[PDB]
Amino acid sequence: MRTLLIRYILWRNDNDQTYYNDDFKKLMLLDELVDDGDVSTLIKNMRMTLSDGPLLDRLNQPVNNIEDAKRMIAISAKVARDIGERSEIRWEESFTILFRMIETYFDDLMIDLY
Amino acid sequence: MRTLLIRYILWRNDNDQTYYNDDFKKLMLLDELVDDGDVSTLIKNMRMTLSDGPLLDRLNQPVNNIEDAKRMIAISAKVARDIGERSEIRWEESFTILFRMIETYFDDLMIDLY
């Protein structure tokens, strides 16, 4: 999961075809669990503050079940999409928190997704 | 640089063709600056300790010039290669340190490489 997720989120940010892979298809389904309202808001704060800030905060909320987890991957994916490819974001940090929160649900996420 | 490097190192670890990209070619040249002796040693300690450990340490040495930087990318790349694709390594951490050390030489690395 770890590697796949890093590639997915990154791809979702620059859309570079050469780093695309059909597994993204299934992951992209999770988008549904996330309201484009929140995403839009988040994006706005990120640009208001010129920072990872807001996103890092959302990634720090708790995750008590696989649904929680899926949502967090989704919110990362959409932010990654809408924020811009020119955005100097230290993706390693976001991944660090994100995996800290969902690492444990990886096995089940695999199953649930593939 | 940040994104390219994450993709390169990860690819160098599982060799998944679908995430391959010819820019890797140039980066792969840097291999030369790194002695396969060190890499082998490092790998051994990582397995002796069952951990990121050793690699994290090498990534923490200082980088005072672009040559230093290139070497560190190289050492990351070869470790990534020889360590194994089944190795549960939290790549986000290594990237965190690695970029902390070479982030500043990105622009010049681009130029020097492409």
Residue numbers in the entry:
A (entry chain A), B (entry chain C): 1 to 114
Paper text:
The full-length wild-type N1 and a C40S mutant were expressed in E. coli, purified, crystallized and the structure was solved at 2.9 Å resolution by MAD analysis of the selenomethionated protein. The C40S mutation was introduced to avoid intermolecular disulphide bond driven aggregation. The crystal contains three dimers per asymmetric unit. The structural model encompasses residues 1–114 (residues 115–7 were not visible in the electron density map) and has an Rfactor/Rfree of 23.7/24.4 %. Note that the C40S substitution is distal to the dimer interface. N1 contains seven α-helices arranged with a fold similar to Bcl-xL and other Bcl-2 family members, including viral counterparts. Comparison of N1 with Bcl-xL using program SHP matched 96 Cαs out of 114 with root-mean-square deviation (rmsd) 2.4 Å, and revealed secondary structure elements representing the BH motifs of Bcl-2 family members equivalent to those in Bcl-xL. The predominantly acidic surface of N1 contains a surface groove formed by helices α2, α3, α4 and the N terminus of α5. In contrast, the N1 groove has an open conformation that could readily bind BH3 regions of pro-apoptotic Bcl-2 proteins. The dimers of N1 observed in the crystal structure are held together by anti-parallel interactions between α1 and α6.
The VACV protein N1 was first described as a secreted protein but was shown subsequently to be a 14 kDa intracellular homodimer that is expressed early in the virus life cycle and contributes to virus virulence in mouse intradermal and intranasal models of infection. Functional analysis demonstrates that N1 inhibits apoptosis both in transfected cells and in VACV-infected cells and, consistent with this, biochemical analysis shows that N1 binds pro-apoptotic Bcl-2 family proteins Bad, Bax and Bid. The crystal structure of N1 reveals that it is a dimeric Bcl-2-like protein with a surface groove that is constitutively open and that is predicted by molecular modelling to bind BH3 motif peptides of pro-apoptotic Bcl-2 family members. N1 is the first VACV protein shown to be a Bcl-2 family member and represents another example of VACV anti-apoptotic proteins.
